[PDB]
């Protein structure tokens, strides 16, 4: 589903600075790809680092990853491989999370991607989610998580 972004979300310069782990997606992407870290740092308004995945194919990847930041939005490009290279939306932006939305090759009538401070999100967090998932006119419960990450006994 198309989200409805908010018409003044900014996104604040080094907000997206060190590691996230994108752990929850809709469409779920995690039968094609899993275990997703994310290393970024700032470059002026813009971001580059690296992101690590494992890879049904390749196993424990990693690749150097460019953020081209503009106003709320972002151009997102992987090195070594393209089909999640997309220009992409910010719905939400939070201490503990941050939401973006693109149309990559990959799913190319939509991704929304929620990427976390923690591995493993507590209660409280995944609330808040919830909740700015809403007022951007999506649902939590058509989202998927990385079952391949143990965040349960
Ligand atoms: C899930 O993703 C995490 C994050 O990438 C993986 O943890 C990382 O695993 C690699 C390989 O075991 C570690 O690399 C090692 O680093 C040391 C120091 O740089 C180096 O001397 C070794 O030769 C090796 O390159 C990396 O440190 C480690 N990171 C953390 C934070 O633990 C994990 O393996 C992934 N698991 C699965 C099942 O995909
Ligand atoms: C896309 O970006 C990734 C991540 O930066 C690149 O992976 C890096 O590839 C180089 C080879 O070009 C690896 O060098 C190797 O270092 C190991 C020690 O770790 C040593 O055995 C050799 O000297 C070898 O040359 C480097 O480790 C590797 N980095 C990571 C984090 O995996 C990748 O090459 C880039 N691909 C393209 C097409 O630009
Ligand atoms: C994705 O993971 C979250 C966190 O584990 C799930 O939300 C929890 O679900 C359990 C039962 O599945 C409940 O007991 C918790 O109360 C839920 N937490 C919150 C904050 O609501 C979520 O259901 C998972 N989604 C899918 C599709 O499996
Ligand atoms: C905002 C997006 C950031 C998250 C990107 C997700 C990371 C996934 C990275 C790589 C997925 C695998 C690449 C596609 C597989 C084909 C590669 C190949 O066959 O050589
Ligand atoms: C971003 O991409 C440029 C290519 O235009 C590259 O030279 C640079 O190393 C990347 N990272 C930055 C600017 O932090």
């Not at 700032?42 to 424990?60: F, K």
């Not at 106003?71 to 719905?91: V, W």
């Not at 090759?105 to 929620?114: E, F, N, R, T, V």
């Amino acid at each position: 589903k198309e989200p409805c972004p908010p018409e003044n979300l900014q996104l604040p310069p080094r907000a997206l600075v060190g590691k996230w782990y994108l752990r929850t997606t809709s469409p779920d992407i995690f039968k094609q790809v899993s275990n997703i870290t994310e290393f970024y740092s700032a470059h002026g308004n813009d971001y580059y680092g690296t992101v690590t995945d494992y890879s049904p194919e390749y196993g424990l990847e990693a690749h150097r990853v460019n953020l081209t930041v503009s106003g709320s939005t972002l151009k997102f490009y992987m090195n070594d491989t393209h089909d999640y290279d997309s220009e992409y939306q910010i719905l939400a932006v939070d201490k503990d999370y941050f939401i973006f939305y693109g149309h990559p090759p990959a799913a190319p009538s939509g991704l929304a991607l929620i990427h976390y401070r923690q591995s493993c999100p507590k209660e409280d967090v995944i609330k808040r989610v919830k909740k700015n998932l809403k007022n951007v006119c999506l649902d939590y419960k058509y989202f998927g998580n990385d079952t391949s990450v143990p965040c349960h006994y």
